[PDB]
Design a protein around this ligand. Structure first.
Ligand SMILES: CCCN(CCC)CCCCCCO
Ligand SMILES: CCCN(CCC)CCCCCCO
Lengths: 129, 131
């Protein structure tokens, strides 16, 4: 923990599992999961919004920093769970990036703008553990 | 729960810092107390004294309540009755845990508990605040 592959503990990522759009998450240690060690090539991630754990292939994870590419507007409008997930993921992104902003969709607005805009001034660097 | 290599576990009395508020006393709780969800790794559910609400707070924006004089905010204390009430509930919990006793308005009961806390929780020291 953690096989040659990408991503380590604390990284903010989008992860893709069956039945769900790309979904924001944080790579965690298997010890945080109360479950089991991850198989080689896999990563435990904890999903923002519901705090649940999934073992996901490192090959189906991308940096949260690739934001606009993987943000899914339709899902965002359809599912309140996705919007909450976005809030909590960007909230963590914010704090790590020493970021400051002035309701759910109210707080989300400057967060999303900051994300879609490249996480300036820190850039992606501000999202690292 | 909370096996992420960070400080603080269930029942700990802490000051927690969130946006728009002074450092505020709280108790670390299990996510099960919250009716919400598991905290993100590196974070803790805390329940704020005074209003009993739950917030998910990074363990790095938490400090032991025992570090009292450092995080007690006198301006907030003088300004907000909610903060004074929170102090009362936080310190009463600390007091019972510490095995401390003192000899009545809110501020009347608060007075020796604050002196106690501000003086370093004598004679137990901060160790007596453990759950
Ligand atoms: C509505 C939120 C649902 N999210 C989906 C995120 C992709 C939780 C999925 C839980 C999967 C556990 C085992 O793999
Ligand atoms: C006046 C009392 C204020 N309390 C505690 C302040 C730290 C309000 C906390 C809001 C909880 C929402 C979830 O995060």
């Amino acid at each position: 923990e953690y096989d040659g592959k990408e991503f380590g503990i604390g990284d903010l990522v989008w992860g893709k599992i069956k039945g769900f759009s790309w979904w924001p998450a944080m790579v965690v240690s298997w010890k945080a999961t109360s479950k089991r060690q991850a198989m080689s090539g896999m990563r435990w991630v904890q999903w923002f919004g519901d705090g649940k754990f999934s073992e996901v292939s490192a090959d189906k994870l991308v940096a949260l920093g690739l934001f606009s590419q993987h943000f899914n507007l339709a899902t965002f409008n359809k599912l309140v769970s996705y919007r909450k997930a976005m809030y909590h993921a960007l909230e963590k992104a914010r704090v790590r990036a020493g970021k400051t902003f002035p309701s759910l969709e109210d707080q989300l607005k400057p967060m999303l703008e900051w994300a879609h805009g490249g996480f300036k001034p820190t850039g992606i660097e501000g999202l690292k553990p």
